[PDB]
Amino acid sequence: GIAREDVVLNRILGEGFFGEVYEGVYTNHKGEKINVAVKTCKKDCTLDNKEKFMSEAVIMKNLDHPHIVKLIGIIEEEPTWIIMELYPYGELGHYLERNKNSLKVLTLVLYSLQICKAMAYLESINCVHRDIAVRNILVASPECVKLGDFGTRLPIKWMSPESINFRRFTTASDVWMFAVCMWEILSFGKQPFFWLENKDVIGVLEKGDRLPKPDLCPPVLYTLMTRCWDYDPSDRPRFTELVCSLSDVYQMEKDIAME
């Protein structure tokens, strides 16, 4: 496994819920130097938050999809370190903001498809991710993003009506939220319903109003987003079907870009 000696902290990366995340270098059993992010848990909330820290680590440790953040190892002895791959382009929302002028639709559709592949995997195990948003999606390379580790100020503007109304979260509410994430991506990181305050969102939804089609979003893709935002969760597509529709859209946008 991994030993603390094999991991050195170089700078701060940022504050996570449970504690500071640092940038470091892990050295392999083969002597390879891997750039890592090291998650830390603040020496605090006795058992409960510290149990939740470890429990979330073990899930991510068992997760292995090419478009979910990669857990490299866990150092359990106090102070506990979770070693993740470092994703050098940071958060998708920031990365979309910076590269607004040069990103084309092909790529926006590709990031959407990647996330949706990750969700199809989660869907296969009836595991609900409740934080499918550009702030929670990391950029591994211009062509590769990874869904972060996020499955009580709730993300109301990202949430399905059932979730806002009853705190029900199912794979179908993740489908609703995933379409909101597509909307963020296609809008270059705008916050959904930025023009409202949280308390106002449900009532807008309840009357059938939806996020408008982003300017660079193909109509075919907006129709997919529309189906995702069906009020009735049974009528929303499943992720396995989104993956197929999204591959088709991607393939069309590539041909269009190439010709």
Ligand SMILES: Nc1ncnc2c1ncn2[C@@H]1O[C@H](COP(=O)(O)OP(=O)(O)OP(O)(O)=S)[C@@H](O)[C@H]1O
């Ligand atoms: N593998 C990574 N590569 C690059 N930046 C990362 C990585 N993991 C986290 N970050 C960044 O570190 C900061 C926050 O870490 P997060 O995991 O988002 O915090 P969090 O979601 O509260 O996580 P925990 O487990 O709850 S502390 C943000 O800047 C993230 O973008």
